[PDB]
Write a protein that binds this ligand. Structure first.
Ligand SMILES: CS(=O)(=O)NCc1c(C(=O)O)n(Cc2cccc3ccccc23)c2ccc(F)cc12
Ligand SMILES: [Zn+2]
Length: 219
């Protein structure tokens, strides 16, 4: 998160930190969010061989009594996910078991106004480290025209997020995190410019509600 603030600890109790063993070799990290006791929503590009989800966290180097760490048993990557265009960058994760609902661990409920918020443990600048602590930032939902420079941008599938006159943005490390507008999840962090210039591109959750509901009904 660029230009944001450290979240109040445990104030976003749906947030999930994902550790992904790369089908090749080492680990990578993404965000995600708990939508049911045993389901997490994240980006398709975060997929890998095996996934661990950490719930209840604030500082990821600091185990607390709030933590619940759960193995993913099934990855449901969107079938039309396209590595080239990055369309349908969405993925459901089934947890080996149900999370205990606590103050620090909770599910996120399912058109938006302009001001939204996003959280994550990603980089705090172009060449900065990832954040040990959960950061958050308020961002403006932009007209699709503001993202016309992204060749594969499709208003039906995606949100255009972040006023270009400011540095405030999701960035690398924030993939899979939810965009909330008025307490409702509208978006999922997907991609943007490598120079961190807003806006960035988020998956439009509403378009995928049939598919989500389908997987939840069958699992
Ligand atoms: C660890 S991972 O599983 O996420 N893989 C690396 C990766 C990232 C990342 O580091 O998060 N992002 C997001 C991202 C990238 C570059 C610029 C961005 C500007 C804004 C927001 C997000 C941005 C990807 C998008 C498409 C993709 F195929 C791979 C990646
Ligand atoms: Zn704490």
């Amino acid at each position: 998160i660029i230009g944001g603030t450290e979240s109040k600890p445990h104030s976003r109790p749906y947030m999930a930190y994902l550790e992904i063993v790369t089908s090749n070799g080492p680990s990578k990290f993404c965000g995600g969010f708990l939508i049911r006791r045993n389901f997490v929503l994240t980006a398709a590009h975060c997929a890998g061989r095996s996934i661990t989800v950490t719930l209840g966290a604030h500082n990821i180097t600091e185990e607390e009594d709030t933590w619940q760490k759960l193995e993913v048993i099934k990855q449901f990557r969107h079938p039309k996910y396209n590595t080239s265009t990055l369309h349908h960058d969405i993925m459901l994760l089934k947890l080996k078991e149900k999370a205990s609902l606590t103050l620090a661990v909770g599910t996120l409920p399912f058109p938006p106004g302009r001001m939204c918020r996003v959280a994550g443990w990603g980089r705090t600048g172009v060449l900065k480290p990832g954040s040990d602590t959960l950061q958050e930032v308020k961002l403006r939902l932009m007209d699709p025209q503001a993202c016309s420079h992204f060749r594969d941008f499709d208003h039906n599938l995606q949100l255009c997020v972040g006023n270009p006159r400011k540095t405030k943005s999701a960035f690398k490390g924030d993939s899979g995190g939810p965009l909330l507008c008025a307490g409702v999840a509208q978006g999922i962090v997907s991609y943007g410019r490598s120079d961190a210039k807003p806006p960035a591109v988020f998956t439009r959750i509403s378009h995928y509600r049939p598919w989500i509901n389908q997987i939840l009904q069958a699992n």
